[PDB]
Amino acid sequence: GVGISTGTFNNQTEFKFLENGWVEITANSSRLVHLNMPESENYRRVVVNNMDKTAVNGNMALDDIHAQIVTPWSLVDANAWGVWFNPGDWQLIVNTMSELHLVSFEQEIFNVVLKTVSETKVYNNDLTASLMVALDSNNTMPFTPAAMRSETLGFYPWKPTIPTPWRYYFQWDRTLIPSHTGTSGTPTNIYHGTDPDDVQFYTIENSVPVHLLRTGDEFATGTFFFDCKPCRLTHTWQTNRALGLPPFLNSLPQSEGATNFGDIGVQQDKRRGVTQMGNTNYITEATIMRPAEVGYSAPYYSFEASTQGPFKTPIAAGRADGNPRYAFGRQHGQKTTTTGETPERFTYIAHQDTGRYPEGDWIQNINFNLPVTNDNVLLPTDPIGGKTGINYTNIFNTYGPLTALNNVPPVYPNGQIWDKEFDTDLKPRLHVNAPFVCQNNCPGQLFVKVAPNLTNEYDPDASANMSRIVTYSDFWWKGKLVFKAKLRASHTWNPIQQMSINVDNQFNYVPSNIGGMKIVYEKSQLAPRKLY
Amino acid sequence: DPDDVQFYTIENSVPVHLLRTGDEFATGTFFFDCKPCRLTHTWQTNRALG
Protein backbone atom coordinates (compact mmCIF):
# COMPACT_ATOMS: atom_id res chain seq x y z
CA GLY A 1 0.00 0.00 0.00
CA VAL A 2 1.22 3.45 -1.00
CA GLY A 3 -0.15 4.99 2.21
CA ILE A 4 2.04 3.09 4.67
CA SER A 5 4.52 5.36 6.42
CA THR A 6 7.94 3.76 6.10
CA GLY A 7 10.22 5.36 8.71
CA THR A 8 10.33 6.85 12.23
CA PHE A 9 11.64 10.23 13.34
CA ASN A 10 14.39 10.06 15.95
CA ASN A 11 16.52 12.84 17.43
CA GLN A 12 17.34 11.34 20.84
CA THR A 13 20.99 11.63 21.88
CA GLU A 14 21.77 8.26 23.42
CA PHE A 15 24.50 7.84 26.02
CA LYS A 16 25.57 4.23 26.61
CA PHE A 17 28.24 3.52 29.21
CA LEU A 18 30.88 0.82 28.70
CA GLU A 19 33.53 -0.91 30.78
CA ASN A 20 36.62 1.05 31.84
CA GLY A 21 34.90 4.42 31.64
CA TRP A 22 34.38 4.73 27.90
CA VAL A 23 30.93 5.99 26.87
CA GLU A 24 29.28 5.55 23.47
CA ILE A 25 27.71 8.88 22.65
CA THR A 26 25.31 8.23 19.79
CA ALA A 27 23.31 11.05 18.22
CA ASN A 28 20.34 10.20 16.09
CA SER A 29 19.21 13.21 14.09
CA SER A 30 16.15 13.86 11.94
CA ARG A 31 14.83 16.77 9.89
CA LEU A 32 12.31 17.58 7.19
CA VAL A 33 14.04 18.52 3.92
CA HIS A 34 12.29 20.59 1.24
CA LEU A 35 13.66 20.21 -2.30
CA ASN A 36 12.40 22.52 -5.02
CA MET A 37 12.77 21.65 -8.69
CA PRO A 38 16.11 22.81 -10.16
CA GLU A 39 15.73 26.08 -12.02
CA SER A 40 18.68 25.23 -14.25
CA GLU A 41 17.57 22.36 -16.46
CA ASN A 42 21.09 21.11 -17.17
CA TYR A 43 24.76 21.27 -16.18
CA ARG A 44 26.15 24.77 -16.50
CA ARG A 45 29.63 26.29 -16.59
CA VAL A 46 30.03 29.82 -15.23
CA VAL A 47 33.00 32.12 -14.71
CA VAL A 48 32.51 34.74 -11.99
CA ASN A 49 34.37 38.02 -12.36
CA ASN A 50 34.04 40.98 -9.99
CA MET A 51 36.37 43.05 -12.15
CA ASP A 52 35.29 46.51 -11.02
CA LYS A 53 35.19 45.61 -7.32
CA THR A 54 38.93 44.70 -7.42
CA ALA A 55 40.22 46.92 -10.26
CA VAL A 56 40.31 50.02 -8.05
CA ASN A 57 43.87 49.95 -6.75
CA GLY A 58 44.59 48.64 -3.28
CA ASN A 59 41.54 46.32 -3.23
CA MET A 60 43.41 43.10 -4.00
CA ALA A 61 41.76 40.92 -1.38
CA LEU A 62 38.26 41.44 -2.80
CA ASP A 63 39.12 39.24 -5.82
CA ASP A 64 36.50 36.56 -6.49
CA ILE A 65 37.48 35.20 -9.91
CA HIS A 66 36.73 31.51 -10.22
CA ALA A 67 35.15 29.03 -12.61
CA GLN A 68 32.55 26.56 -11.43
CA ILE A 69 30.10 24.00 -12.77
CA VAL A 70 26.59 24.39 -11.37
CA THR A 71 24.39 21.36 -11.59
CA PRO A 72 20.76 20.23 -11.33
CA TRP A 73 21.61 18.28 -8.16
CA SER A 74 21.59 19.36 -4.51
CA LEU A 75 23.54 18.18 -1.47
CA VAL A 76 22.15 17.05 1.90
CA ASP A 77 25.41 17.42 3.87
CA ALA A 78 25.16 16.84 7.63
CA ASN A 79 28.85 17.49 8.40
CA ALA A 80 28.53 19.97 11.26
CA TRP A 81 28.12 19.58 15.01
CA GLY A 82 24.93 21.62 15.22
CA VAL A 83 23.10 19.05 13.09
CA TRP A 84 23.58 16.37 15.77
CA PHE A 85 23.92 17.80 19.30
CA ASN A 86 21.64 20.28 21.05
CA PRO A 87 23.18 22.72 23.55
CA GLY A 88 22.52 20.39 26.48
CA ASP A 89 24.21 17.45 24.79
CA TRP A 90 27.20 19.62 23.97
CA GLN A 91 27.30 20.80 27.58
CA LEU A 92 27.45 17.25 28.90
CA ILE A 93 30.03 16.24 26.29
CA VAL A 94 32.47 19.09 26.83
CA ASN A 95 31.98 19.22 30.60
CA THR A 96 32.54 15.47 31.21
CA MET A 97 34.43 13.89 28.29
CA SER A 98 38.18 14.20 27.68
CA GLU A 99 39.08 12.11 24.63
CA LEU A 100 36.67 11.63 21.73
CA HIS A 101 36.67 9.10 18.88
CA LEU A 102 34.48 9.46 15.80
CA VAL A 103 33.27 5.90 15.21
CA SER A 104 30.58 5.46 12.56
CA PHE A 105 27.92 7.26 10.56
CA GLU A 106 24.85 6.52 8.47
CA GLN A 107 21.93 8.21 6.73
CA GLU A 108 18.56 7.34 5.27
CA ILE A 109 15.71 9.10 3.48
CA PHE A 110 12.08 8.12 4.01
CA ASN A 111 8.48 9.32 3.76
CA VAL A 112 9.12 11.31 0.60
CA VAL A 113 6.17 13.17 -0.91
CA LEU A 114 6.04 15.00 -4.24
CA LYS A 115 3.62 17.70 -5.37
CA THR A 116 2.73 19.62 -8.53
CA VAL A 117 1.36 23.16 -8.27
CA SER A 118 -0.94 25.00 -10.67
CA GLU A 119 -3.11 28.10 -10.94
CA THR A 120 -4.95 31.64 -6.69
CA LYS A 121 -2.53 28.73 -6.53
CA VAL A 122 -3.43 25.06 -6.09
CA TYR A 123 -1.31 22.24 -4.64
CA ASN A 124 -1.75 18.69 -5.96
CA ASN A 125 -0.13 15.35 -5.25
CA ASP A 126 1.57 13.40 -8.06
CA LEU A 127 2.05 9.80 -6.96
CA THR A 128 4.04 9.05 -10.15
CA ALA A 129 6.82 11.61 -9.62
CA SER A 130 10.17 10.56 -8.19
CA LEU A 131 12.94 11.98 -6.11
CA MET A 132 16.35 10.99 -7.47
CA VAL A 133 18.95 9.99 -4.87
CA ALA A 134 22.62 9.08 -5.30
CA LEU A 135 25.36 8.31 -2.77
CA ASP A 136 29.01 8.62 -3.83
CA SER A 137 30.24 5.44 -2.19
CA ASN A 138 33.76 5.75 -3.71
CA ASN A 139 34.19 9.56 -3.36
CA THR A 140 34.40 9.98 -7.12
CA MET A 141 32.96 13.48 -7.13
CA PRO A 142 34.57 16.69 -5.88
CA PHE A 143 34.38 16.77 -2.11
CA THR A 144 32.34 19.86 -1.26
CA PRO A 145 31.68 20.07 2.48
CA ALA A 146 28.88 22.53 3.08
CA ALA A 147 30.23 23.74 6.44
CA MET A 148 32.76 26.26 5.13
CA ARG A 149 29.98 28.25 3.41
CA SER A 150 27.52 27.48 6.24
CA GLU A 151 25.22 25.47 3.98
CA THR A 152 24.70 22.32 6.06
CA LEU A 153 21.29 21.17 7.28
CA GLY A 154 19.53 23.51 9.66
CA PHE A 155 20.47 22.95 13.27
CA TYR A 156 16.96 23.17 14.71
CA PRO A 157 15.21 19.76 14.62
CA TRP A 158 11.65 21.03 14.29
CA LYS A 159 12.26 23.75 11.70
CA PRO A 160 12.28 22.58 8.05
CA THR A 161 15.46 22.74 5.99
CA ILE A 162 16.50 23.02 2.34
CA PRO A 163 19.49 21.29 0.67
CA THR A 164 22.04 23.57 -0.94
CA PRO A 165 22.29 23.57 -4.75
CA TRP A 166 25.46 21.71 -5.65
CA ARG A 167 28.41 23.06 -7.61
CA TYR A 168 32.14 22.44 -7.93
CA TYR A 169 35.24 24.24 -9.13
CA PHE A 170 36.30 24.02 -12.75
CA GLN A 171 39.87 25.02 -13.62
CA TRP A 172 40.88 28.56 -14.49
CA ASP A 173 44.03 30.60 -15.08
CA ARG A 174 44.15 34.06 -13.53
CA THR A 175 46.69 36.65 -12.42
CA LEU A 176 46.37 39.78 -10.31
CA ILE A 177 49.49 41.82 -9.64
CA PRO A 178 48.81 43.56 -6.29
CA SER A 179 48.84 47.31 -5.80
CA HIS A 180 48.04 50.09 -3.34
CA THR A 181 45.94 53.22 -3.48
CA GLY A 182 48.20 55.67 -5.25
CA THR A 183 49.74 53.08 -7.54
CA SER A 184 50.58 54.85 -10.78
CA GLY A 185 48.28 52.86 -13.06
CA THR A 186 46.32 49.70 -13.68
CA PRO A 187 48.22 46.53 -12.67
CA THR A 188 48.01 43.38 -14.71
CA ASN A 189 44.61 41.93 -13.78
CA ILE A 190 43.38 39.42 -16.35
CA TYR A 191 41.76 36.02 -16.87
CA HIS A 192 43.71 33.58 -19.04
CA GLY A 193 40.85 31.19 -19.76
CA THR A 194 41.37 27.55 -18.84
CA ASP A 195 44.24 25.18 -19.50
CA PRO A 196 43.16 22.19 -21.64
CA ASP A 197 45.38 19.73 -19.83
CA ASP A 198 43.44 19.67 -16.53
CA VAL A 199 39.71 20.10 -17.26
CA GLN A 200 37.50 17.71 -15.26
CA PHE A 201 33.78 17.80 -16.06
CA TYR A 202 32.25 15.35 -13.61
CA THR A 203 28.54 14.52 -13.74
CA ILE A 204 26.42 12.74 -11.17
CA GLU A 205 24.58 10.71 -13.80
CA ASN A 206 27.77 9.23 -15.25
CA SER A 207 29.82 8.56 -12.12
CA VAL A 208 27.48 6.96 -9.55
CA PRO A 209 24.23 4.97 -9.41
CA VAL A 210 20.97 6.88 -9.04
CA HIS A 211 17.97 5.38 -7.25
CA LEU A 212 14.46 6.61 -8.02
CA LEU A 213 12.30 6.58 -4.92
CA ARG A 214 8.85 7.13 -6.56
CA THR A 215 6.89 8.36 -3.54
CA GLY A 216 6.81 5.11 -1.52
CA ASP A 217 10.35 3.73 -0.99
CA GLU A 218 13.33 4.16 1.35
CA PHE A 219 16.98 4.81 0.67
CA ALA A 220 19.44 3.65 3.32
CA THR A 221 23.17 4.14 3.51
CA GLY A 222 25.27 1.43 5.02
CA THR A 223 27.15 2.10 8.22
CA PHE A 224 30.39 3.81 7.26
CA PHE A 225 33.14 3.33 9.85
CA PHE A 226 35.65 6.12 10.40
CA ASP A 227 39.39 5.77 11.05
CA CYS A 228 40.32 9.16 12.52
CA LYS A 229 42.77 9.92 15.28
CA PRO A 230 40.96 11.04 18.46
CA CYS A 231 40.26 14.66 19.28
CA ARG A 232 41.06 16.08 22.71
CA LEU A 233 38.44 18.09 24.58
CA THR A 234 41.17 19.52 26.86
CA HIS A 235 43.62 22.36 26.18
CA THR A 236 47.25 22.98 27.10
CA TRP A 237 48.42 26.00 29.10
CA GLN A 238 52.17 25.42 29.28
CA THR A 239 53.78 27.77 26.84
CA ASN A 240 57.51 27.43 26.33
CA ARG A 241 58.64 29.30 29.44
CA ALA A 242 56.55 26.98 31.67
CA LEU A 243 58.12 23.66 30.63
CA GLY A 244 60.58 21.95 32.91
CA LEU A 245 61.80 22.36 36.45
CA PRO A 246 61.52 25.99 37.65
CA PRO A 247 64.43 27.78 39.35
CA PHE A 248 64.93 27.37 43.10
CA LEU A 249 63.88 30.16 45.43
CA ASN A 250 66.65 31.28 47.77
CA SER A 251 64.38 33.64 49.76
CA LEU A 252 60.64 33.10 49.91
CA PRO A 253 58.53 36.07 51.05
CA GLN A 254 57.74 36.37 54.75
CA SER A 255 54.39 38.20 54.73
CA GLU A 256 51.08 37.82 52.92
CA GLY A 257 49.79 40.17 50.22
CA ALA A 258 50.05 40.19 46.44
CA THR A 259 52.65 43.00 46.46
CA ASN A 260 55.26 40.66 47.94
CA PHE A 261 57.56 38.72 45.59
CA GLY A 262 60.07 35.93 46.07
CA ASP A 263 63.72 36.45 45.14
CA ILE A 264 66.21 34.27 43.34
CA GLY A 265 69.36 35.03 45.27
CA VAL A 266 72.07 34.08 42.81
CA GLN A 267 73.49 36.75 40.53
CA GLN A 268 72.78 36.90 36.81
CA ASP A 269 75.85 35.03 35.53
CA LYS A 270 76.44 32.79 38.60
CA ARG A 271 73.37 30.58 38.00
CA ARG A 272 73.61 26.91 37.01
CA GLY A 273 71.95 25.20 34.08
CA VAL A 274 72.10 24.63 30.34
CA THR A 275 71.50 27.19 27.60
CA GLN A 276 71.81 27.40 23.84
CA MET A 277 73.55 30.76 24.48
CA GLY A 278 76.76 29.23 23.24
CA ASN A 279 78.87 32.38 23.77
CA THR A 280 77.14 34.12 26.71
CA ASN A 281 76.91 33.17 30.36
CA TYR A 282 73.63 34.71 31.54
CA ILE A 283 71.23 31.89 32.39
CA THR A 284 67.71 33.33 32.54
CA GLU A 285 64.22 31.95 32.24
CA ALA A 286 64.23 33.36 28.71
CA THR A 287 67.50 31.64 27.77
CA ILE A 288 67.42 28.24 29.51
CA MET A 289 67.03 25.33 27.11
CA ARG A 290 63.44 24.20 27.31
CA PRO A 291 62.92 20.69 25.89
CA ALA A 292 61.34 21.80 22.61
CA GLU A 293 59.21 24.54 21.08
CA VAL A 294 55.44 24.82 21.50
CA GLY A 295 53.58 26.80 18.88
CA TYR A 296 55.15 28.74 16.07
CA SER A 297 55.08 32.20 14.58
CA ALA A 298 53.82 32.37 11.01
CA PRO A 299 53.69 35.33 8.64
CA TYR A 300 50.39 36.96 9.52
CA TYR A 301 48.10 38.19 6.75
CA SER A 302 50.39 36.82 4.07
CA PHE A 303 48.83 36.35 0.63
CA GLU A 304 50.38 34.08 -2.00
CA ALA A 305 49.51 33.35 -5.62
CA SER A 306 49.26 30.15 -7.54
CA THR A 307 48.20 30.44 -11.16
CA GLN A 308 44.59 30.11 -9.92
CA GLY A 309 44.94 33.48 -8.15
CA PRO A 310 45.85 34.81 -4.72
CA PHE A 311 44.84 33.27 -1.41
CA LYS A 312 45.54 33.85 2.27
CA THR A 313 48.20 31.57 3.67
CA PRO A 314 46.60 29.67 6.58
CA ILE A 315 47.66 29.96 10.21
CA ALA A 316 47.42 27.21 12.80
CA ALA A 317 46.74 29.17 15.99
CA GLY A 318 47.16 32.58 17.57
CA ARG A 319 46.08 34.95 20.29
CA ALA A 320 42.97 39.72 16.30
CA ASP A 321 44.60 37.36 13.80
CA GLY A 322 44.57 33.59 13.48
CA ASN A 323 41.37 32.85 15.39
CA PRO A 324 38.62 31.81 12.96
CA ARG A 325 35.57 33.96 12.28
CA TYR A 326 32.24 32.31 11.46
CA ALA A 327 29.41 34.08 9.60
CA PHE A 328 26.05 32.34 9.71
CA GLY A 329 22.36 32.82 8.99
CA ARG A 330 18.81 32.11 10.17
CA GLN A 331 18.92 28.31 10.11
CA HIS A 332 22.46 28.17 11.56
CA GLY A 333 22.14 30.01 14.89
CA GLN A 334 20.77 33.51 14.36
CA LYS A 335 17.77 34.63 16.34
CA THR A 336 15.34 33.41 13.72
CA THR A 337 12.91 36.33 14.12
CA THR A 338 15.55 39.03 13.46
CA THR A 339 14.88 40.81 10.17
CA GLY A 340 17.37 41.84 7.51
CA GLU A 341 19.98 40.10 5.40
CA THR A 342 22.97 40.77 7.66
CA PRO A 343 24.49 37.55 9.09
CA GLU A 344 25.48 37.11 12.71
CA ARG A 345 29.19 36.73 13.42
CA PHE A 346 31.60 35.60 16.09
CA THR A 347 35.34 35.08 16.33
CA TYR A 348 36.20 31.95 18.30
CA ILE A 349 38.76 33.12 20.84
CA ALA A 350 40.00 29.68 21.80
CA HIS A 351 41.76 28.65 24.98
CA GLN A 352 44.29 26.85 22.74
CA ASP A 353 47.04 29.10 24.10
CA THR A 354 49.97 27.76 22.02
CA GLY A 355 49.81 30.94 19.91
CA ARG A 356 52.14 33.89 19.56
CA TYR A 357 52.18 37.58 20.49
CA PRO A 358 54.07 39.45 17.74
CA GLU A 359 54.40 42.73 19.66
CA GLY A 360 56.81 41.07 22.15
CA ASP A 361 59.26 39.38 19.80
CA TRP A 362 62.73 40.61 18.93
CA ILE A 363 66.01 39.65 17.29
CA GLN A 364 69.42 40.71 18.48
CA ASN A 365 72.97 40.37 17.27
CA ILE A 366 75.05 37.31 18.07
CA ASN A 367 77.53 39.10 20.32
CA PHE A 368 74.77 39.65 22.90
CA ASN A 369 76.35 42.56 24.74
CA LEU A 370 73.44 42.62 27.10
CA PRO A 371 72.34 46.28 27.57
CA VAL A 372 71.90 46.24 23.86
CA THR A 373 72.23 49.30 21.60
CA ASN A 374 69.77 50.23 18.85
CA ASP A 375 72.04 49.14 16.01
CA ASN A 376 72.14 45.55 17.37
CA VAL A 377 68.36 44.94 17.82
CA LEU A 378 65.44 44.46 15.46
CA LEU A 379 62.22 45.28 17.27
CA PRO A 380 58.60 44.88 16.15
CA THR A 381 58.53 48.67 15.70
CA ASP A 382 61.30 48.72 13.06
CA PRO A 383 60.25 49.07 9.38
CA ILE A 384 60.92 46.50 6.68
CA GLY A 385 61.68 47.93 3.25
CA GLY A 386 60.87 51.42 4.49
CA LYS A 387 57.19 50.51 4.93
CA THR A 388 56.45 51.82 8.41
CA GLY A 389 53.39 49.62 8.92
CA ILE A 390 55.13 46.29 8.19
CA ASN A 391 57.67 44.86 10.65
CA TYR A 392 59.93 41.83 10.70
CA THR A 393 57.32 39.73 12.49
CA ASN A 394 55.04 40.01 9.47
CA ILE A 395 57.61 38.13 7.34
CA PHE A 396 58.93 35.83 10.08
CA ASN A 397 58.41 32.07 10.26
CA THR A 398 59.65 29.89 13.12
CA TYR A 399 58.25 26.61 11.89
CA GLY A 400 60.99 24.13 12.49
CA PRO A 401 61.69 20.56 13.49
CA LEU A 402 61.34 21.45 17.16
CA THR A 403 57.79 22.81 16.88
CA ALA A 404 54.74 21.17 18.46
CA LEU A 405 51.05 21.98 18.13
CA ASN A 406 47.56 20.82 19.05
CA ASN A 407 44.65 20.01 16.80
CA VAL A 408 42.22 22.78 15.99
CA PRO A 409 39.46 22.85 18.62
CA PRO A 410 35.89 21.87 17.88
CA VAL A 411 33.56 24.85 17.68
CA TYR A 412 29.83 24.50 18.23
CA PRO A 413 27.37 24.81 16.37
CA ASN A 414 28.82 26.03 13.08
CA GLY A 415 32.00 23.93 13.12
CA GLN A 416 32.70 21.03 10.79
CA ILE A 417 33.00 17.47 12.14
CA TRP A 418 35.09 15.56 9.55
CA ASP A 419 37.15 16.28 6.44
CA LYS A 420 38.87 14.16 3.83
CA GLU A 421 42.66 14.21 3.74
CA PHE A 422 44.38 15.63 0.67
CA ASP A 423 45.21 12.97 -1.91
CA THR A 424 48.93 13.79 -2.12
CA ASP A 425 51.99 11.73 -1.27
CA LEU A 426 52.98 14.25 1.43
CA LYS A 427 49.91 15.09 3.51
CA PRO A 428 49.27 18.06 5.82
CA ARG A 429 49.85 17.34 9.48
CA LEU A 430 46.63 19.07 10.57
CA HIS A 431 43.50 20.45 8.94
CA VAL A 432 42.42 23.92 9.94
CA ASN A 433 38.76 23.36 9.10
CA ALA A 434 37.79 20.28 11.14
CA PRO A 435 39.20 18.15 13.97
CA PHE A 436 38.72 14.62 12.62
CA VAL A 437 40.79 14.09 9.48
CA CYS A 438 39.86 11.02 7.45
CA GLN A 439 42.37 8.55 6.02
CA ASN A 440 40.23 6.37 3.69
CA ASN A 441 37.10 7.22 1.73
CA CYS A 442 35.01 9.04 4.33
CA PRO A 443 31.27 9.27 3.93
CA GLY A 444 29.73 9.37 0.49
CA GLN A 445 28.13 12.72 -0.20
CA LEU A 446 24.39 12.26 -0.70
CA PHE A 447 22.94 14.07 -3.73
CA VAL A 448 19.24 14.58 -4.44
CA LYS A 449 17.28 15.92 -7.40
CA VAL A 450 13.71 15.74 -8.70
CA ALA A 451 13.20 13.64 -11.81
CA PRO A 452 11.97 15.84 -14.73
CA ASN A 453 8.16 15.69 -14.84
CA LEU A 454 7.64 17.04 -18.34
CA THR A 455 4.45 18.16 -20.09
CA ASN A 456 3.02 16.90 -23.38
CA GLU A 457 4.46 19.86 -25.30
CA TYR A 458 8.04 18.57 -25.15
CA ASP A 459 10.26 18.28 -28.21
CA PRO A 460 13.96 17.65 -27.46
CA ASP A 461 14.92 18.64 -31.01
CA ALA A 462 13.89 22.21 -30.19
CA SER A 463 16.60 24.23 -28.44
CA ALA A 464 14.21 25.93 -25.99
CA ASN A 465 14.31 24.96 -22.32
CA MET A 466 12.07 22.00 -21.54
CA SER A 467 8.68 22.72 -19.95
CA ARG A 468 8.59 21.15 -16.50
CA ILE A 469 5.39 20.74 -14.58
CA VAL A 470 6.36 23.01 -11.70
CA THR A 471 6.95 20.62 -8.83
CA TYR A 472 8.65 20.16 -5.49
CA SER A 473 9.21 17.48 -2.89
CA ASP A 474 9.43 17.01 0.84
CA PHE A 475 11.28 14.14 2.45
CA TRP A 476 12.41 13.21 5.94
CA TRP A 477 16.15 12.68 6.42
CA LYS A 478 17.51 10.65 9.31
CA GLY A 479 20.97 9.57 10.38
CA LYS A 480 22.95 8.06 13.23
CA LEU A 481 26.37 9.34 14.36
CA VAL A 482 28.31 7.15 16.80
CA PHE A 483 31.20 8.29 19.00
CA LYS A 484 33.22 6.76 21.80
CA ALA A 485 34.52 9.01 24.58
CA LYS A 486 36.51 8.85 27.83
CA LEU A 487 35.18 10.56 30.96
CA ARG A 488 37.31 13.06 32.85
CA ALA A 489 39.27 12.33 36.05
CA SER A 490 40.03 14.82 38.84
CA HIS A 491 43.81 14.83 38.70
CA THR A 492 44.04 18.33 40.25
CA TRP A 493 42.88 19.91 43.49
CA ASN A 494 41.36 23.03 41.95
CA PRO A 495 38.08 22.78 40.04
CA ILE A 496 38.30 22.98 36.26
CA GLN A 497 36.38 25.46 34.10
CA GLN A 498 32.70 24.59 34.04
CA MET A 499 30.33 25.35 31.20
CA SER A 500 27.09 26.60 32.69
CA ILE A 501 23.95 28.63 32.20
CA ASN A 502 24.11 31.74 34.36
CA VAL A 503 22.35 35.02 35.07
CA ASP A 504 24.05 36.73 32.10
CA ASN A 505 22.59 34.19 29.63
CA GLN A 506 19.54 32.62 31.39
CA PHE A 507 17.35 34.35 28.78
CA ASN A 508 19.69 33.34 25.91
CA TYR A 509 19.00 29.64 25.24
CA VAL A 510 15.28 29.65 26.15
CA PRO A 511 12.95 30.49 23.21
CA SER A 512 11.36 33.92 22.87
CA ASN A 513 7.71 34.89 23.18
CA ILE A 514 7.53 35.65 19.44
CA GLY A 515 8.73 32.08 18.82
CA GLY A 516 12.23 32.97 17.66
CA MET A 517 15.16 30.94 18.95
CA LYS A 518 18.94 31.09 18.73
CA ILE A 519 22.04 28.97 19.22
CA VAL A 520 24.99 30.91 20.62
CA TYR A 521 28.54 29.72 20.14
CA GLU A 522 30.12 27.69 22.93
CA LYS A 523 33.66 26.78 23.94
CA SER A 524 34.88 23.20 23.47
CA GLN A 525 38.26 22.61 25.15
CA LEU A 526 37.61 23.55 28.77
CA ALA A 527 39.67 21.52 31.20
CA PRO A 528 43.48 22.07 31.22
CA ARG A 529 45.80 19.22 30.22
CA LYS A 530 49.40 19.14 31.41
CA LEU A 531 51.59 19.23 28.32
CA TYR A 532 54.78 18.16 30.08
CA ASP B 1 44.41 32.69 33.97
CA PRO B 2 41.65 30.70 35.74
CA ASP B 3 41.21 28.58 32.61
CA ASP B 4 44.77 27.29 33.06
CA VAL B 5 45.01 26.88 36.83
CA GLN B 6 46.41 23.57 38.06
CA PHE B 7 47.50 22.67 41.59
CA TYR B 8 48.93 19.27 42.51
CA THR B 9 49.61 17.84 45.89
CA ILE B 10 51.61 14.66 46.01
CA GLU B 11 49.19 13.57 48.73
CA ASN B 12 46.07 13.61 46.53
CA SER B 13 47.91 12.36 43.40
CA VAL B 14 50.16 9.39 44.26
CA PRO B 15 50.21 6.67 46.95
CA VAL B 16 52.78 7.26 49.70
CA HIS B 17 54.77 4.66 51.62
CA LEU B 18 56.12 5.22 55.14
CA LEU B 19 59.44 3.49 55.66
CA ARG B 20 60.14 3.92 59.43
CA THR B 21 63.91 3.22 59.57
CA GLY B 22 63.77 -0.52 58.82
CA ASP B 23 62.05 -1.08 55.48
CA GLU B 24 63.05 -0.74 51.83
CA PHE B 25 61.11 0.35 48.74
CA ALA B 26 61.81 -0.75 45.17
CA THR B 27 60.17 0.16 41.90
CA GLY B 28 59.10 -2.26 39.27
CA THR B 29 61.39 -2.32 36.26
CA PHE B 30 60.11 0.24 33.78
CA PHE B 31 60.75 -0.80 30.17
CA PHE B 32 61.41 1.88 27.58
CA ASP B 33 60.13 2.24 24.01
CA CYS B 34 62.84 4.64 22.81
CA LYS B 35 64.23 4.85 19.31
CA PRO B 36 67.99 4.17 19.01
CA CYS B 37 70.76 6.72 19.38
CA ARG B 38 73.73 6.79 17.02
CA LEU B 39 77.19 7.30 18.52
CA THR B 40 78.51 8.36 15.09
CA HIS B 41 78.37 11.66 13.24
CA THR B 42 77.67 12.57 9.64
CA TRP B 43 80.37 14.62 7.94
CA GLN B 44 78.71 15.10 4.55
CA THR B 45 77.14 18.50 4.13
CA ASN B 46 74.94 19.12 1.10
CA ARG B 47 77.99 20.05 -0.98
CA ALA B 48 79.50 16.55 -0.59
CA LEU B 49 76.68 14.17 -1.63
CA GLY B 50 76.49 12.17 -4.83
Swiss-Prot record, chain A:
Superkingdom to which the source organism belongs: Viruses
Binding site for Mg(2+): 138
Major localization listed first in the record, in broad terms: virion
Keyword Cell cycle among record annotations: no
GO molecular function, one term: metal ion binding
Role according to the record: Capsid protein self-assembles to form an icosahedral capsid with a T=1 symmetry, about 22 nm in diameter, and consisting of 60 copies of two size variants of the capsid proteins, VP1 and VP2, which differ by the presence of an N-terminal extension in the minor protein VP1. The capsid encapsulates the genomic ssDNA. Capsid proteins are responsible for the attachment to host cell receptor TFRC. This attachment induces virion internalization predominantly through clathrin-endocytosis.
Protein family according to the UniProt entry: Belongs to the parvoviridae capsid protein family.
Note: The capsids of autonomous parvoviruses expose a proportion of VP2 N-terminus and part of that sequence can be cleaved of to form VP3.
Protein name as annotated: Capsid protein VP1
